[PDB]
């Protein structure tokens, strides 16, 4: 018997449940062969990839459909090589390469991340007794920014947006003075500040995915009110 292509390829999102049929590429005589309906397919141990035959399974020898037996993880292993035996009841093998696709199992992280990430506290300073027109937008060091820890969601159209907010802060009148744009994390002064009533603000900034699976990250934001001096 003789496989019809030199190689076969398949892709699988890591969120794919066990039980799912993940390859059907032998359908329509595309497997190994006048076809007789007597060629049966089996998965084999691969010295090069010992886990591969534990992870994939062929329930129906005649059909050759590969089903997923164990969960996958894009963040751990991204490529498998499955050896498929094809015997006639009247042997050859081929190699299926299964690539794992990145699924949405992680939320954002604030930048810069320095290894996981150390606690990040952003810095901003506000001169007292000046108008918002003079100061806006407030410069933050380093610039507030978060990215999805899922580094390779495909296509990009599937990628979630990121929403930024102020979860909490002290003193608690921060919302009088500060607004954060949900989509740009831009920070605006709303009113002038007098240092004799307000010296500093410690806020917790939140980044969440906008796709119903928030998985939020958090980061500090320390704002000093600078003395007119
Ligand atoms: Ca994963
Ligand atoms: Ca992922
Ligand atoms: Ca994600």
From Swiss-Prot:
Part of the intact protein present: 145 to 389 of 1955
Record: glycosylation sites: 53
Annotated disease: Usher syndrome 1F: USH is a genetically heterogeneous condition characterized by the association of retinitis pigmentosa with sensorineural deafness. Age at onset and differences in auditory and vestibular function distinguish Usher syndrome type 1 (USH1), Usher syndrome type 2 (USH2) and Usher syndrome type 3 (USH3). USH1 is characterized by profound congenital sensorineural deafness, absent vestibular function and prepubertal onset of progressive retinitis pigmentosa leading to blindness.
Domain notes: Cadherin repeats 1 and 2 mediate calcium-dependent heterophilic interaction with CDH23. Three calcium ions are usually bound at the interface of each cadherin domain and rigidify the connections, imparting a strong curvature to the full-length ectodomain.
Tissue: Expressed in brain, lung, kidney, spleen and testis. Found also in the inner and outer synaptic layers, and the nerve fiber layer in adult and fetal retinas. Found in the supporting cells, outer sulcus cells and spiral ganglion of fetal cochlea. Expressed in cytotoxic tumor-derived T- and NK-cell lines as well as biopsies of nasal NK/T-cell lymphomas. Not detected in normal or in vitro activated peripheral blood cells, CD4 or CD8 lymphocytes or NK cells. Isoform 3 is expressed in brain, heart, cerebellum and kidney.
Subcellular location, record wording: Cell membrane
Originating gene: PCDH15
Lineage: Eukaryota, Metazoa, Chordata, Craniata, Vertebrata
Top-rank taxon, per record: Eukaryota
Stated name of the protein: Protocadherin-15
Function: Calcium-dependent cell-adhesion protein. Essential for maintenance of normal retinal and cochlear function.
